[PDB]
């Protein structure tokens, strides 16, 4: 019942240029943004006018925006969460407000995979996945059945390259 597709907006050259000029003049759209740096790439999720992502990918960097570089409005190293004021065009999603344990993890590759809520910040995968299928999907949203944000994907628990559960930042903090 929840479905997603991706749309690319830049390649390497544009990406490197934009990092130095801190000025992304492309159209913004969508609920989840595919973010990149020099070293690594990952996701951001817009909730209540704020692009949220993970510190272990974004660090304390600005987000290249239309008017110029955007400072982080929120920065927590421990809980591995950072937020920028969302640029104009982003479609801001909304928190859960229902408590369903039936979750959906949206990946980097616009794949929606079933997740069982187990703890306050934990959920198990119903079908184990290769770790490479999940890599780069940090900051991707965990959705409730009606497609509201339960949390943001942070880390996975693995055994020999196959992930059997996910840890996420719960939405309440945001």
């Amino acid at each position: 019942p929840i479905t997603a597709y991706s749309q690319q907006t830049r390649g390497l050259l544009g990406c490197i240029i934009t990092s130095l000029t801190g000025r992304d003049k492309n159209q913004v759209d969508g609920e989840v943004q595919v973010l990149s740096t020099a070293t690594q790439s990952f996701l951001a999720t817009c909730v209540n006018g704020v692009c949220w992502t993970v510190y272990h990918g974004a660090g304390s960097k600005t987000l290249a925006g239309p008017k110029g570089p955007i400072t982080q409005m929120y920065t927590n190293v421990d809980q591995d969460l950072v937020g920028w004021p969302a640029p104009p065009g982003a479609r801001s999603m909304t928190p859960c407000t229902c408590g369903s344990s039936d979750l959906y993890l949206v990946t980097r590759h616009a794949d929606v995979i079933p997740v069982r809520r187990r703890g306050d910040s934990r959920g198990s995968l119903l079908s184990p996945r290769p770790v490479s299928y999940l890599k780069g999907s940090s900051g991707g949203p965990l959705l409730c059945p009606s497609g509201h944000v339960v949390g943001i994907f942070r880390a996975a628990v693995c055994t020999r390259g196959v992930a059997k559960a996910v840890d996420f930042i719960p939405v309440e903090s945001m």
Binding site: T18, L43, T62, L63, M93, V106
Partner: peptide, 12 residues
């Protein structure tokens, strides 16, 4: 060095 949007994902 700024983080850059290199794509988006649209949900429904």
């Amino acid at each position: 060095g700024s983080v850059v949007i290199v794509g988006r994902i649209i949900l429904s």
